[PDB]
Design a binder for these strands. Structure first.
Ligand SMILES: Cc1cn([C@H]2C[C@H](O)[C@@H](COP(=O)(O)OP(=O)(O)OP(=O)(O)O)O2)c(=O)[nH]c1=O
Ligand SMILES: Cc1cn([C@H]2C[C@H](O)[C@@H](COP(=O)(O)OP(=O)(O)OP(=O)(O)O)O2)c(=O)[nH]c1=O
Ligand SMILES: Cc1cn([C@H]2C[C@H](O)[C@@H](COP(=O)(O)OP(=O)(O)OP(=O)(O)O)O2)c(=O)[nH]c1=O
Ligand SMILES: Cc1cn([C@H]2C[C@H](O)[C@@H](COP(=O)(O)OP(=O)(O)OP(=O)(O)O)O2)c(=O)[nH]c1=O
Ligand SMILES: Cc1cn([C@H]2C[C@H](O)[C@@H](COP(=O)(O)OP(=O)(O)OP(=O)(O)O)O2)c(=O)[nH]c1=O
Ligand SMILES: [Mg+2]
Ligand SMILES: [Mg+2]
Ligand SMILES: [Mg+2]
Ligand SMILES: [Mg+2]
Ligand SMILES: [Mg+2]
Lengths: 255, 259, 271, 276, 274, 271
DNA sequence: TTTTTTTTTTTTTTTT
């Protein structure tokens, strides 16, 4: 609250898992920590699932920790083909000839799935508790929560109690609310902390909020800005940096 | 359990990867979004009179003659006979439902009828989820068109979640048409205003539980209102969005041709 | 089941295809939109006091004498006696209600009953003396009288957003199930910047009160404009805003009022 | 049912066009040449700026319609109480300004001329006043039309009945009040004058400094110009008394525009016709 | 309910012999075309931000309280109670009290503080208010229970803190409080920003449509008085008074000129000729 | 809640038994008479013309030289940055502009001699970066017992009219009946035509951007002008725009800016 | 005992 001037005697004289791409994130929020609930809030088609899938790939090969996915947005094979194409630096699911040309398919399969690292998913709290106890998962990702006031808040309190009981890194993605006046978030508007559907617990029981903004109907729709909106451990919020998508490969890279 | 490890999944991916349907007119659509694919939900949104039903009816003609795929219509906006007379006139290069003399001059009616309806391609429609499940199971329909959803907040959201679950369970191409919202300040969409993704009635889940959004713009009270512009707003597969191309209507014939 | 195969539809199309009602005055209308057709919903718009009821009254007059079709008026805005007197004055070429030296002159000459059965001698016109009750009354007009044209004077006083949406869907379902020609008249909304509509401002398709459902479930929209406090408030403009069946829109023509008589007649005006 | 056929409506029309009609205005000639008076079952609305004479002209009209024409006039004035709007009519009848002079008030207290001026004006039951929820107001107006049998009813300052009522959205309340009031006026067939205000202009001159007022300047909603039969606006510039009349919408006739010029007399309070 | 106009003979006479205009001070030009203030009379007083609203209002409250016997109730919300009380005492003693620490230190020692206090507050003609629905209730308790004649409010924008509906409901409640009670009600409001031109604080003549908050404020007010002064010009203490609206008399325009005295705080009637 | 004039016999006598002087220039105190309990002071200039430097200098003068508890709420930067700014301003150096100067003071042990001379007397308090701010300022006023509270860069806290009007109303209600001097730093609106604020435009009172309620609840308004592009970039001008207490507006004096210690001195420039 | 869309009307400000 109120900080006295006597507690600045030495401070004037004055981590966890790291994020891949846009290096002003782990410079700013000091990476992810155990027991946290990270929210990734952006508009439609802004690259939420792509960013969290890149994070999941960089936390399953360079980190080696057991990663449990909850992709209720698409099937379990397409999200694996996206991982294989991302890892192999080549846009896989959107090129027609290469998908039958490479079938060395076992060579590209086993190089990234030789371990028992990744655990995909086709009640949900019991499934995540099983993924946490019987499998040793350290990163749990949930992509779509809007299908899973009072029932939203009870679900969020139950997820927060599960996270406090376990100590697992948890990344949950939800959507934005429809702007009522002016332009939209998809065309150059910064995301506020108010812009959240469902209820108001998304900015209360979470620990950090990451937003991505790009002008989709513009001259360069592949040049995002990343914004931190909340961070209980640091307080450093605002602009992180800029990334490009690199449409040949699909890796989000800062520049 | 419902857990699936990444190790025991080499078969299910191999049988999965072992473009899809194309769009006719303004060929910078399948140059941009690479045409339609399976299991999708496609939204076609424009203003009143902009040419939504004309575009989807031309697409339904072009997917039932050269493709031969089973097409299931749901034209809740109009009757079941006018939507067939428009297909007959469009296939026969003649503005049929507007010329009174030719409608009685041709009656060669069966000659124009059998050439396009000799197959079991098209299945029309005069609870709705059970009807669409029947049209998908007992008929083999690969394309399902729904002309109007606003006559069918939570009542739209639960309906869209159930439609997306049905599309996920079946793997059917599904096109759904809804309208634009009311603009508050400035010009209207009917006089040359570009469309943002905000312009959707009902709620905001329409842009979140879909896969692509296609919009048309034409200056109706202008000098040449027969020159549409097509805009792609969203594409989860590619990301390529923006102005695709132009189509002229060719008022004598009725075919949208790219020029 | 409600599925229909396209193969088993050869006969129902043949009995279906086996122009419609023309419009009177400003002959660029029926050249452009080709008149009304059975099973439509028509919108007529203008500013306040610009003559929407005046324009639809001439059409109800010309559709009852030259056509012979059953016409059902729904004058929610006024009484039945006043619109009956205005129809009599509009047919007999004489401004009736707006002249008191003649309203007592024709009742003593005995030719009032001559002018009465000259236009009301048939069973053409059916007036309405004022939601679900209105729908039941229009259904009884359609079934129990065989009406071809049903005119609704004013829709804004029916609502005493979702209640406008449900009403418009129900009216479209009624007019499609019975196939009756249905005309609906509404007003415009207050513009925020610039001039008002009454001094010659052209009307866009946004300017519709209540909600935006008035243009998404209607087949054609006709707007009429006239510079009221101008050089002359007689030369009116007619604009087609939307048409599903024909498509061609824009300015149709130019009419004058003929203040001595009151007939909207087309006149020569290029620009 | 209500499906009245056009054939079985003969004698009704014979008893409609034979009878009412008329009830001319005062102060100007061009007003009656365009609007052709006030008729039973209509709505005539008069607007001005702030403090421009939308009450003086109407009380001057209510003096003429209650004395020289015998019609029972009911004044629902809500700006002032019944003690002042009945006192100003006496002075306007006697061609003076009674409230604006403390000499003549004490003089008519002394000599007894107040009783002569009271019983000369109110010798016949022609003026019915009302003192100040929207429910009981229409009930008292229905009591004026049914029990008292009023022929002219003047409702002044409709802005006070939309602002003293607790409503979230004001536009629907104005619309519902206007359609219920027009339903009352059409069912009863009584002449009903309703007085409302104007709103703030966006830029340019102000309405109290000579701005030519248009029809879209009505304050509160757009239901005020859609359900009225006649709209008359008054415009002057503070020649601080030269007031002109503008017909904005005539539904009966078609002649609208500049009707004429009036001059307000600072001594008597009458709206005399001008020459210009 | 409704009444007939022939049962009013016993009250129209009773209103005819009751109502008396309370004369303004500082300028005779205001009282020439307004004839004062009566029972049931809402007077709006406005000028630019810092041009002398509360000073002229405080002078009017001082002259109607200690010289005319009217019981005056103030509801000053800009300042505290002791600050406006000290300013009333210093204004009545023709000095500038709170702007001088030496005089405030001097008058507490020689015992003339009570000499200045009891000469004003001995008759008990003034009442003060110490800081939406409870405010009108306390004003009703001030009117009925205490028996005050002229109620003065200051800085209406606190009570409204959508603003247009709130200020319209508030103006309707204050008009209903003023009418059918017989109480003078003085209301102070501010001015919105001019779009183009110069500022009101630099000498622009103020029009009628500068009253911020709604358009309903000048519709339910009976008499509107505006002040102006050019503090950046050659003569920064020569104010002008403009009567914008007068429902009773109908004469609007320039009233006169007043000169403000920097040493006594009494703005007096000047003799400037435009 | 209503108190009559008879109960104020000893309260007014309690009120008679002091303005905190403005340092840096004596031309301000000639026409402002300091600042009392409940004296809202608005301080503004152009974009980067030294609002934070002048207000931090006045807080440094009021804190360690006059014995007043000073509470800052700098939202432009965090706690340690403005702490380094206070220490480097008191010790007459330019601390955050040379890395050797930050390194020299810690290698010789004189860094602890600068903390204890400033923050050892408990006369300073800082705040770490909308209704949650007022509840903490209330605990700073009541619990800690401070006298001069400063808030900077109001655009962080704040349709940008209703929010700033409610904020200014709540701050005025907090500063009234408390006995606290609350200084608020704001900005100016952008110039549309003419010269800019970085060139020496003569400022008016209606330049407070966001609303018009910032000059209606402020008690003393001070504006600074610095011509960084002209001949003298180190000369500032102080203009009083509004004084409720006295009423004297215009140029107060002249001060010269320094690029050696960070301070700015009282000058005697001639116009 | 709570979050999101649609819509007509009155005011106070905002940019490149
Ligand atoms: C972020 C981004 C995506 N794209 C393209 C490629 C992506 O596969 C496609 C969409 O990105 P996705 O990350 O797949 O979007 P999403 O699944 O998170 O959306 P939602 O959950 O709201 O339905 O758009 C770009 O072209 N440039 C970009 O910067
Ligand atoms: C698309 C288009 C239509 N038209 C004409 C001919 C069409 O039959 C008519 C309307 O076309 P429709 O395709 O029927 O219009 P719509 O379905 O989008 O509108 P709604 O459902 O809201 O009523 O307009 C053109 O002239 N040029 C064009 O580009
Ligand atoms: C169309 C037209 C009408 N008029 C005048 C003469 C008629 O007596 C008068 C009647 O018009 P109305 O038909 O009553 O106008 P309206 O119904 O559109 O307006 P409202 O919303 O108030 O119902 O219009 C002209 O003068 N010139 C014209 O061209
Ligand atoms: C018309 C007119 C009136 N007057 C005087 C006569 C009256 O005393 C006063 C008009 O009083 P009102 O007519 O009662 O005021 P108003 O109705 O115009 O406005 P509102 O009720 O909304 O406040 O002005 C003139 O001096 N010159 C004029 O030209
Ligand atoms: C009347 C007058 C006062 N003054 C001085 C003494 C006044 O107390 C002071 C103006 O303050 P106020 O008299 O209080 O004026 P105000 O009500 O318009 O301001 P606010 O809303 O902010 O409270 O300035 C002048 O300089 N010139 C003048 O003409
Ligand atoms: Mg996604
Ligand atoms: Mg359609
Ligand atoms: Mg009409
Ligand atoms: Mg009046
Ligand atoms: Mg003041």
């Amino acid at each position: 609250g109120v900080v006295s001037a006597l507690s600045l005697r030495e401070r004037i004289r004055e981590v966890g898992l790291l994020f891949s791409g846009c290096t002003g994130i782990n410079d700013k929020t000091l990476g992810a920590r155990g027991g946290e609930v990270i929210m990734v809030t952006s508009g439609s088609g802004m690259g939420k699932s792509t960013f969290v899938r890149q994070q999941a790939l960089q936390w399953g090969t360079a980190m080696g920790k057991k990663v449990g996915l909850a992709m209720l947005q698409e099937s379990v094979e397409e999200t694996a083909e996206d991982l294989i194409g991302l890892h192999n630096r080549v846009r896989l699911r959107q090129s027609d000839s290469l998908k039958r040309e490479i079938i060395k398919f076992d060579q590209w399969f086993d190089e990234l799935f030789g371990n028992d690292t990744f655990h995909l998913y086709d009640r949900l709290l019991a499934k995540l508790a099983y993924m946490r106890s019987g499998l040793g998962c350290d990163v749990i990702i949930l992509d779509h929560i809007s299908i899973v006031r009072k029932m939203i808040d009870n679900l969020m309190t139950k997820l927060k109690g599960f996270a406090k009981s376990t100590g697992v890194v948890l990344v949950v993605i939800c959507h934005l609310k429809n702007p009522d006046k002016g332009k939209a978030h998809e065309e150059g508007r910064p995301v506020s902390i108010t812009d959240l559907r469902g209820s108001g617990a998304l900015r209360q029981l979470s620990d950090t909020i990451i937003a991505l903004e790009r002008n989709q109907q513009g001259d360069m729709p592949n040049l995002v800005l990343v914004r931190i909106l909340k961070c209980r451990f640091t307080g450093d919020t605002g602009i992180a940096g800029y990334m490009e998508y690199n449409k040949e490969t699909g890796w989000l890279e800062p520049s």
